[PDB]
Amino acid sequence: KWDYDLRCGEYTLNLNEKTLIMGILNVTPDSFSDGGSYNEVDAAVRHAKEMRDEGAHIIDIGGVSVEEEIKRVVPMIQAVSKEVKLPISIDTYKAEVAKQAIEAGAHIINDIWGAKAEPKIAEVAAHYDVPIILMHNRDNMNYRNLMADMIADLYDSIKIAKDAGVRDENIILDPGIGFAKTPEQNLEAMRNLEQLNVLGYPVLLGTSRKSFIGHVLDLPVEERLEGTGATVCLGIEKGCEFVRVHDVKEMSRMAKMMDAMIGK
Ligand X SMILES: C[C@H](CC(=O)O)c1nn(C)c2nc(N)[nH]c(=O)c2c1=O
Catalytic site residues?
210, 244
**Among ligand X, a second copy, none, residue 66 binds (CB under 5-8 Å by kind):** none
Q: Which helix (H) or strand (E) holds 101?
A: helix 95-104
Residues that bind a second copy (CB under 8 A): 187, 190-191, 213, 216-217, 219, 226-227, 229-231, 233-234, 237, 250-251, 253-254, 256-258, 260-263
Task: List strand residue ranges (DSSP E) for the chain, in order.
Answer: 6-8, 11-13, 20-24, 58-61, 88-91, 108-111, 132-135, 171-174, 204-205, 242-245
Distance from C-alpha of 213 to C-alpha of 233, rounded to nearest angstrom: 14
Beta carbon nearer to ligand X, 206 or 227: 206
Beta carbon nearer to ligand X, 81 or 207: 207
Distance from C-alpha of 237 to C-alpha of 5, rounded to nearest angstrom: 21
Contacts of 258 (CB under 8 A, 6+ apart): 19, 232, 233, 236, 237, 264
The neighbouring-strand residues paired with 23 are 59, 245
Judged by CB under 6 A, the stretch of 33-41, 95-103, 170-178, 229-237 that binds ligand X is 170-178
| Contact between 112 and ligand X per CB under 6 A | yes
Q: Is 144 exposed, middle or buried (0-12, 13-18, 19+ CB in 10 A)?
A: exposed
| Contact between 62 and ligand X per CB under 6 A | yes
**Among ligand X, a second copy, none, residue 110 binds (CB under 5-8 Å by kind):** ligand X
Total residues contacting ligand X by CB under 6 A comes to 13
Beta carbon nearer to a second copy, 117 or 216: 216
DSSP category for residue 30 = P
Site string for ligand X, 173-192 (x = CB under 6 A): -x--xx--------------
Q: Is 37 exposed, middle or buried (0-12, 13-18, 19+ CB in 10 A)?
A: middle
Q: Which of 19, 81, 100, 110 binds ligand X (CB under 6 A)?
A: 110
Phi, psi for residue 139 in degrees, rounded to 5: -90, 5
Q: Which of 8, 15, 135, 193 binds ligand X (CB under 6 A)?
A: 135
Q: Which of 23, 29, 131, 206 binds ligand X (CB under 6 A)?
A: 206
**Among a second copy, ligand X, none, residue 170 binds (CB under 5-8 Å by kind):** none
Phi, psi for residue 22 in degrees, rounded to 5: -95, 115
Could you tell me if residue 105 is left (phi over 0), alpha (psi between -120 and 50 degrees) or otherwise beta?
Answer: left
Judged by CB under 6 A, the stretch of 73-81, 171-179, 231-239, 254-262 that binds ligand X is 171-179
> Which residues here bind ligand X, judged by CB under 6 A?
24, 62, 91, 110, 112, 133, 135, 174, 177-178, 204, 206, 244
